[PDB]
Design a protein around this ligand. Structure first.
Ligand SMILES: [Cl-]
Ligand code: NA
Length: 129
């Protein structure tokens, strides 16, 4: 599914990401644009060979098992495939654990490289609040 911007803003708020660990809702919406262009089915290979999955692009080396990544820890106890669904819950439960892993949202290179230091409110500007 390719969420609409406000559709995705609305869903992430439902699961309690607005201001989670101090990161405003727009930082999450901003992360989800640039990680995946808003698409729950998104999958991209990383050079270590790991793969990034879904809306936020949760990585198989730590976070999820895909069966082809040596040394995977499956720190969300989950199949990476389940994070491609239309029901963003597993991705949120996992993202809450990543962000809580100390480096915060800097765990997402597109957040660091593109969201951080910006007015992340443009990402929810027009959302019915
Ligand atoms: Cl932080
Ligand atoms: Na893993």
């Amino acid at each position: 599914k390719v969420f609409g911007r406000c559709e995705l803003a609305a869903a992430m708020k439902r699961h309690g990401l607005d201001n989670y660990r101090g990161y405003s809702l727009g930082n999450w919406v901003c992360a989800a644009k640039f990680e995946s262009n808003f698409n729950t089915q998104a999958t991209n290979r990383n050079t270590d060979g790991s793969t990034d999955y879904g809306i936020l692009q949760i990585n198989s080396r730590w976070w999820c098992n895909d069966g082809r990544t040596p040394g995977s820890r499956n720190l969300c106890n989950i199949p990476c495939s389940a994070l491609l669904s239309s029901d963003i819950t597993a991705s949120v439960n996992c993202a809450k654990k990543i962000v809580s892993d100390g480096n915060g949202m800097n765990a997402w290179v597109a957040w660091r490289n593109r969201c951080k230091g910006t007015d992340v409110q443009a990402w929810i500007r027009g959302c019915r609040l």
